[PDB]
Amino acid sequence: APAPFADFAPPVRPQSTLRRAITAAYRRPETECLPPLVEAATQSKEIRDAAASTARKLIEALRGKGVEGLVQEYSLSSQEGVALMCLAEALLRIPDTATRDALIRDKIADGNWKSHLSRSLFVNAATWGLVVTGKLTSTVNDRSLAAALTRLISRCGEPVIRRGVDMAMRMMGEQFVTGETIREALKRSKELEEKGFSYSYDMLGEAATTAADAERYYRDYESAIHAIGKASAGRGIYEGPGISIKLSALHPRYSRAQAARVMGELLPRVKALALLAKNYDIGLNIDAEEADRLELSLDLLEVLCLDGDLSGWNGMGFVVQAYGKRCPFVLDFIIDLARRSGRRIMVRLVKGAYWDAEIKRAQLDGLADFPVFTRKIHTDVSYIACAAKLLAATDVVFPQFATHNAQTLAAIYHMAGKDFHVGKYEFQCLHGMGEPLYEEVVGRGKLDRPCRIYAPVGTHETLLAYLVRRLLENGANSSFVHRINDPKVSIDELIADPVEVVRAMPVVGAKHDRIALPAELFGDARTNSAGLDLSNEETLASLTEALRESAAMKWTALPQLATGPAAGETRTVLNPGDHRDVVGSVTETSEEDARRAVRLAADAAPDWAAVPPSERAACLDRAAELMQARMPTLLGLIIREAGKSALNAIAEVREAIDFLRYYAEQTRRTLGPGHGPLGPIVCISPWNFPLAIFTGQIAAALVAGNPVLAKPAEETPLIAAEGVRILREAGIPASALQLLPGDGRVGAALVAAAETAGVMFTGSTEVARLIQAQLADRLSPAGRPIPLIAETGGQNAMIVDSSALAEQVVGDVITSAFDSAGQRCSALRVLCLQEDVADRILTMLKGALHELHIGRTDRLSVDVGPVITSEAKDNIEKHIERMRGLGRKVEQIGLASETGVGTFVPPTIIELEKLSDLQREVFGPVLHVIRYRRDDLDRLVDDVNATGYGLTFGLHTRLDETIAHVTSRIKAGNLYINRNIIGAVVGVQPFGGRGLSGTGPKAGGPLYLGRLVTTAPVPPQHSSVHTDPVLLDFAKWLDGKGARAEAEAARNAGSSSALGLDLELPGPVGERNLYTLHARGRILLVPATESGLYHQLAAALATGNSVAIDAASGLQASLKNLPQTVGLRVSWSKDWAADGPFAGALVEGDAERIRAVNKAIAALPGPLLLVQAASSGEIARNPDAYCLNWLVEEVSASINTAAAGGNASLMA
Amino acid sequence: FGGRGLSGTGPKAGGPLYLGRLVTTAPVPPQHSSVHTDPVLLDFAKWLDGKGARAEAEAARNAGSSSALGLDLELPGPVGERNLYTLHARGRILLVPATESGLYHQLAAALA
Amino acid sequence: REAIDFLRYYAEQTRRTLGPGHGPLGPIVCISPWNFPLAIFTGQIAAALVAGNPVL
Ligand SMILES: *[C]/[C]=[C]/N1=C2[C]=C([C])C([C])=[C]C2=N([C][C]([O])[C]([O])[C]([O])[C]OP([O])(=O)OP([O])(=O)O[C][C]2O[C](N3[C]=NC4=C3N=[C]N=C4[N])[C]([O])[C]2[O])C2=C1C(=O)[N]C(=O)[N]2
Ligand SMILES: NC(=O)c1ccc[n+]([C@@H]2O[C@H](COP(=O)([O-])OP(=O)(O)OC[C@H]3O[C@@H](n4cnc5c(N)ncnc54)[C@H](O)[C@@H]3O)[C@@H](O)[C@H]2O)c1
Ligand SMILES: [Mg+2]
């Protein structure tokens, strides 16, 4: 039996002093990074003057010397230019030239281009938009482009099509790539090699998602090395061409979490390529990628440079990124490695290509700081400082200064001085971008310094995959290439010395003013929770010890009544991934003590309600600080008790911290003396988010002034008991928060107890239906229904069309379906693939499936942990075998023998024929796949809605028409565009669904606290200037019937309604997070009086709903001669169960009438209904008798606006 | 400029639909598109699909896409003013069909 | 000013749209009110003309 966390994340090798100094700088404050870089980058006034003159001379040459001319000749708008290039791209996909010209002449030019050209013409329009406009739009307005294409063809005919085709052919065959194949690229390299340039070839491709794709990239590199080495023909590593590789192309799990696989499987592949480069004596450069791959790549560089089989060859090269805070320390490590190995490492200094992505990633992960600078000028100073370090070590490394910035170039040219020989150092540039600049550098007639051109190689399909990066770079106002073209910027501004500009700043190295540190994402509202960097060796080493120590603690959970801990039946709590690992002990609550706890809560309710809301919120904030400080220990418990990986557990604790701080702030924004608490609230929580949802419900209830009976899931009582301990330490009195461990009997006994004033339930729909039935008997002392928040299961779909990027889709599907072994309510259950791309994506998906590591979760390398119990395993497996028995194709990962000691289900893909093949939620790692024809998209959305669930939903598309269509027709609470559908963030994606998925209001949203008090407050930002027009028609109808008071109340409801609220919530860069209020659907009205009916109808119509009115009320004659607009919204129901599903209900009557109706409503099939009831007298006295908060439906939508490959907003 | 009802047939003078009325085949005006698809059009297309009216369902989907209903633009003009231009439904269209297929095509155009 | 703007606007809209498949109707009769005696007069005529129609 392995000791817990004994092998959590051991580093590849012991960290040397030089390696440790790299790690120490990972997220160093920007003000601390800059001063040493300023000093190292300082040059004499003579040199600065000479560099400025050289820079000015280069820039004057640049300014003194395609698509734009085409746009001009045919008077094209921007959209027409983009549409034309998309058409040209499509026509070039026709291989035969004569066939293409015939299609152009006879079919395209003469009329309908649409009739002749499963994939939108405009799939790559974001790229062409960058080419035409210099601006990035993350999605494509495909209806605008279609109109523009029709317009331009009808106006200009075949000549403009011919010119667009020839332009696209030149750009895609000669400008974006040096050649389509390595042979073609080598042929086209001779011209500039004869002038003194050299080449490094980049076999374009995506990062590997599968073993097969990594093997394909390997054979592509190997074949390119042969062609390059044959062409090099003994010219050597400086004069002759070389190759550049990206490590992520060569292994599908290139990450620190999979370090052992990287060293075991990726390293030999790089070695084999390096051995071939050695035999031909060409350069082989390792390109630099995301910041969390930097230090991992150093372990590969170390082993390769120490491997005697590669000795005698100085061609191994390595990129370092000057925008990274570790860059000078990385260079110290590399220079020392070069000395130790005796290999003259070729070091390519770049500024860095992932800037926007690094900012977004650090914010999402809640880390202390960025791993890159945030002011562009800091990167420039870093680059020059690092060049000074490299130029002092040319005996042991070969510096390669990759830049298109003439000021950067000039500064280094003069820094390097007058002594030069080929092999001392070189410059580098990108094909088709740097030739103008370096034609003023290479050659005895210029500066007589060599330049190596980085040459992309690949077909048109491969090039379009990630061309947005370079184009977005050259279009950013900070980019030299953009500024060199901007007439509004002078040469003086372009030759400004960044070293002296930074030195003279009032605070040297201050963070960019307009970029939020992750902790400050929400500004003054609240402090963001902090995460942990699992790529940081210091963090991993510290976490290893804290996690081990957490496994040595004697975790217990006891019935913590107001009077003290109670005795009960005690049993062990076992690790679901290894039942030999005893995590702790739980004493469960007798039904007698559960009922006693409710009585003690009722007795203590006045004392807790009298704690002012601000001080209740202070308790929540103190609990958040405690959980943040205790996160490492909490991680260890969650990992072992609940089957979570370290990443899952960090997200779990962060979410609890965010709940505490969000509900505290929402309290400070809203709660006053008139928002009286309900009374004792029973909080019943699921096993699968055993700290986050547990904490969220309890915190909300407590901060609203209610004492809480906390009933955690029987599977996960320990982390629950620890959360209660933290809340009590933070100042929640024992009488206000009682913990009652146990199974559903304890939950049921709490729900049924006389003094229970409200219930907050998260769990299965079936259990919620049992609680709904138990509460249907019950009324408050005021004679009103006991409020129930019931947040339940999902049957969550993702729709993928042929414009989506397969690698992006597969990553988001793998994460959404199999993270936490599918044991998220948000998990992806049904993937819907457009038929034209289904086979390719499915093959990639199955390949990615088999790269997952399943096992006990106290190892960083484990991706997918166990299912929670043997019963859950049996239920999931029964479903899989039923599907297999029907002949459906089933793909499963093989499980390791070690899983036998726990309860594991392998990640599984099941190919279905129809969405109706699924019956109920299968809460496990089981992804179902269905295919659809594009014309059937609307019917597919119907099919998704038809399950009756409505929790999470994903859409992958680049096409605005498809976004608008799908998002307007889908009925789900949490929408996600071009991203995964999991990990909703508190106050950013307020979380919760509709139908069988929930009553609402959403947890982590602004309507939540208002449900836990007798009179709901007005939430922040909660209003709408829009008035429902059917409500307005009804108010006029009422005035025509003489019902003057009801017409006034109807108009007031129309104004009070927040239907149409449409907000963007603050969050991370690279994402737009939207929150909107919609109609719920059809509301069941059960009136008793005419005026009651009018008030009910006004409330329902003002919030956008239709209604079904109880025909047994006998009030038909009160609604004669309705306007057709109102009649369209009104039906009469004799059999309520036949006319559903409803989305809520309004009831009028005395207490016993309300009780009877509530029993009838609870018996309706399908979704739990949020019921509001009032007496006739209450309707007359209280305009808010029916609260409009609960008659609208919240919808959250999260759009990944970086999905096109970059962040347009941050480029400015 | 131009109105509806007793005030005009349209298209508006000084607007982008105007010239297209004065030729036998109207062009696609500048900026004339919409990403929104009428939901009743979508339901009509599915109904046509179920009946096997394949040409008509295709015509309906094409009308749904090329319709500029929902266009909502800000036009360039002076500072201190916002000048908006939007395309709404006309209202109720009189349909005078002769054949079943003609009626389906008329319905597609009107619903879209 | 309005007459000038009609002229230049329909000129530009023509440059943005009209090609060989956008055939003219033929003779167009332009009947105008007294109250905008140059602006609407010019606008209707200019549009019909630039669309390729002779005007009465
Ligand atoms: C595959 C890969 C590749 N590589 C390379 C190579 C070569 C030869 C070259 C030339 C390049 C490359 N890359 C890219 C780089 O990095 C960059 O990006 C470019 O180059 C640009 O730079 P330049 O020319 O220098 O320009 P400028 O303009 O001067 O600059 C720009 C830059 O900056 C920065 N930023 C911006 N913004 C900002 C910044 N920072 C801070 N803050 C702020 N706000 C950035 O960086 C930009 O970019 C590459 C490579 C590799 O390998 N890796 C990488 O990463 N990259
Ligand atoms: N909508 C959401 O936000 C959300 C979030 C997480 C999980 N869920 C759902 O939760 C389910 C998985 O969690 P689970 O397995 O712990 O759910 P569950 O329904 O099996 O149990 C949830 C809680 O109800 C209690 N319970 C069982 N019977 C009860 C009864 N008769 N009366 C009162 N309480 C009773 C349990 O002890 C537990 O504390 C999934 O269906 C998942 O989709 C929903
Ligand atoms: Mg259960």
From TrEMBL, chain A:
> By its UniProt entry, which Pfam families does this protein fall under?
Aldedh, Pro_dh, Pro_dh-DNA_bdg, PRODH
Origin organism lineage: Bacteria, Pseudomonadati, Pseudomonadota, Alphaproteobacteria, Hyphomicrobiales
Tell me the ranges covered by the Aldehyde dehydrogenase domain, including all copies: 569-1006
InterPro entries, per database record: Ald_DH/histidinol_DH, Ald_DH_C, Ald_DH_CS_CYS, Ald_DH_N, Aldehyde_DH_dom, Bifunct_PutA, FAD-linked_oxidoreductase-like, PRODH
Give the cofactors, semicolon-separated. Answer: FAD
Q: Does this entry carry the keyword Cytoplasm? A: no
Please tell me the species this chain comes from. Answer: Rhizobium meliloti (strain 1021) (Ensifer meliloti)
Q: What class of enzyme is it?
A: oxidoreductase
Write down the Gene3D superfamilies for this protein, in alphabetical order. 3.20.20.220, Aldehyde Dehydrogenase, Chain A, domain 1 (3.40.605.10), Aldehyde Dehydrogenase, Chain A, domain 2 (3.40.309.10), Single helix bin (1.20.5.460), Single Helix bin (1.20.5.550)
GO cellular component terms? cytoplasmic side of plasma membrane
Q: What does this protein do?
A: Oxidizes proline to glutamate for use as a carbon and nitrogen source.
Domain Proline dehydrogenase PutA: from-to ranges:
67-176
Pathway stated in the Swiss-Prot or TrEMBL entry: Amino-acid degradation; L-proline degradation into L-glutamate; L-glutamate from L-proline: step 1/2; Amino-acid degradation; L-proline degradation into L-glutamate; L-glutamate from L-proline: step 2/2
Do the record's keywords include Transcription regulation?
Answer: yes
Compositional bias, Low complexity, is annotated for 1-10
Enzymatic reactions:
L-proline + a quinone = (S)-1-pyrroline-5-carboxylate + a quinol + H(+); L-glutamate 5-semialdehyde + NAD(+) + H2O = L-glutamate + NADH + 2 H(+)
State the family it belongs to.
In the C-terminal section; belongs to the aldehyde dehydrogenase family.
For biological process, the GO terms are:
L-proline catabolic process to L-glutamate
Per UniProt, which keywords does this protein have?
DNA-binding, FAD, Flavoprotein, Multifunctional enzyme, NAD, Nucleotide-binding, Oxidoreductase, Proline metabolism, Repressor, Transcription, Transcription regulation
Q: What is its EC number?
A: 1.5.5.2, 1.2.1.88
Which GO molecular function annotations are given, in alphabetical order? DNA binding; DNA-binding transcription factor activity; L-glutamate gamma-semialdehyde dehydrogenase activity; nucleotide binding; proline dehydrogenase activity
Binding of NAD(+) occurs at: 685, 687, 711, 714, 764, 792, 921
Which residues constitute the catalytic centre? 791, 825
Q: Where is the Proline utilization A proline dehydrogenase N-terminal domain positioned along the sequence?
A: 16-63
Protein name as catalogued: Bifunctional protein PutA
Q: Which residues form the Proline dehydrogenase domain?
A: 185-483
